[PDB]
């Protein structure tokens, strides 16, 4: 049960500075080096640097020294990384990875997240349109177009539906998301009984329930 | 520019041995690089398997081993498991900083091959009434997890206003993904044919609709 808990995600405006966290539990915090990695889909991974919890001894990747500041609070066993003067380029997932020294060298445990989004875009409610066929028996759908910023919650028939439902990840065109969720049903329920997706966008305090109709 | 490189993707079956390799651009990968191998499973779950060229991180199954082959670092997985399907990352130490590879997306054929289940949705009139059109093409139940989606308007390949998601693992372990085609209501009213082409394991599937 060695654990590295990290906030799932944080939203911040370009030009600001965030302070990400990595709570450690399970092992003696000060006898393991801690590292910070940055990942952006398409790019792969980049090493930011490492801090030595016992000394506070720090070591950076030159490309990140005037942008990141690593530190730790021994009593609470958590590690921090403060990113400054945020830009688009700094939108990414930032991992904290525990490091093993001597006997040998190990990068054993990893925290799991914290995707950071740096955008100067205002909240935007989604638009929900019913996806019906033109023409496991019939597939239906809900298009959740143009909302900002993540996440969104899609449910089908308030939970009454468990199978066939496939919510997809969001795409980002024009600094604006969009996704869709699908649910397949026996040609019997449709149009006999009817399906209704339950889109919810927390940031915009919006909830739209749409029933899918014939076409 | 000291870049590190790896195999984009490799495929193996349950029980077989497979080797992943790591190139150093400076030259031979040596012990002084302390090769580190990291595993990334679905939904960003990372775990380091081998550190320091061949030290197995405690708690890691014995079927994982590291070494040097030629002038490259290697990750040997013997007796390939189904859970072992994941992408593997390589990390080298160059004096004062680490450098990763692009990662090798490893496929362990732990289930039968299944072609994509494609569905093409036309533009809803509600969206149409806002002067914008969107075709949605859901692609489910395919394995392995790689497909190539192509859109075609009037039989002609279109490559603008197109967004395809990266395949995502389903409940039953198969892969699903979605693609989109957005146009102005106007643009949509002049063409007659619209089709979502999905290519999987050399077999191509299409779903068309005529406005």
């Amino acid at each position: 049960q060695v654990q590295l808990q990290q906030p799932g995600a944080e939203l911040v405006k370009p030009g600001a500075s965030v302070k990400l966290s990595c709570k450690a539990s399970g092992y003696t915090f000060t006898s393991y080096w801690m590292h910070w990695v940055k990942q952006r889909p398409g790019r792969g991974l980049e090493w930011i640097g490492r801090i030595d919890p016992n000394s506070g001894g720090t070591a950076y990747n030159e490309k990140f020294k005037s942008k990141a500041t690593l530190t730790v609070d021994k009593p609470s066993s958590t590690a921090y990384m403060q990113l400054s003067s945020l830009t688009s380029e700094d939108s990414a997932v930032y991992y904290c990875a525990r490091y093993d020294y001597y006997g040998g060298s190990y990068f054993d445990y990893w925290g799991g997240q914290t995707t950071l989004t740096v955008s100067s875009a205002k909240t935007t409610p989604p638009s929900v349109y019913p996806l019906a066929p033109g023409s496991s028996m019939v597939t239906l759908g809900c298009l959740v177009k143009g909302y900002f910023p993540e996440p969104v919650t899609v449910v089908w028939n308030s939970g009454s539906l468990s199978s066939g439902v496939h919510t997809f990840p969001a795409v980002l065109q024009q600094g604006l998301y969009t996704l869709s969720s699908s649910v397949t049903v026996p040609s019997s329920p449709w149009p006999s009984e009817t399906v209704t997706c339950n889109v919810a966008h927390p940031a915009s305090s919006t909830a739209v329930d749409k029933a899918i109709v014939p076409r | 520019q000291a870049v590190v490189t790896q195999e984009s993707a490799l495929t193996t079956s349950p029980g077989e041995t497979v080797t992943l390799t790591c190139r150093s651009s400076t030259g031979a990968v040596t012990t002084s690089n302390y090769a580190n191998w990291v595993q990334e499973k679905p939904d960003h779950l990372f775990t380091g398997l081998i550190g320091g060229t061949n030290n197995r991180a405690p708690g890691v199954p014995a079927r994982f081993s590291g070494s040097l082959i030629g002038d490259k670092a290697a990750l040997t997985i013997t007796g390939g498991q189904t859970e072992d399907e994941a992408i593997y990352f390589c990390a080298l130490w160059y004096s004062n900083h680490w450098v990763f590879g692009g990662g090798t997306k490893l496929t362990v054929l732990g289930q039968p091959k299944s072609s994509p289940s494609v569905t093409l949705f036309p533009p809803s009139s509600e969206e149409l009434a806002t002067n914008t059109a969107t075709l949605v093409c859901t692609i489910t139940d395919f394995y392995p997890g790689v497909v190539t989606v192509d859109w075609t308007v009037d039989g002609t390949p279109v490559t603008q206003g197109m967004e395809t998601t990266q395949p995502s693992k389903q409940s039953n372990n198969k892969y699903m993904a979605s693609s989109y085609l957005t146009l102005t209501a106007a643009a949509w009213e002049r063409h007659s044919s619209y089709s979502c082409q999905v290519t999987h394991e050399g077999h191509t599937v299409e779903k068309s609709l005529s406005r």
Partner: peptide
């Protein structure tokens, strides 16, 4: 250049 001691802040 690192991998310890002489370096806290770099």
């Amino acid at each position: 250049d690192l991998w310890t001691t002489a370096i806290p802040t770099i």
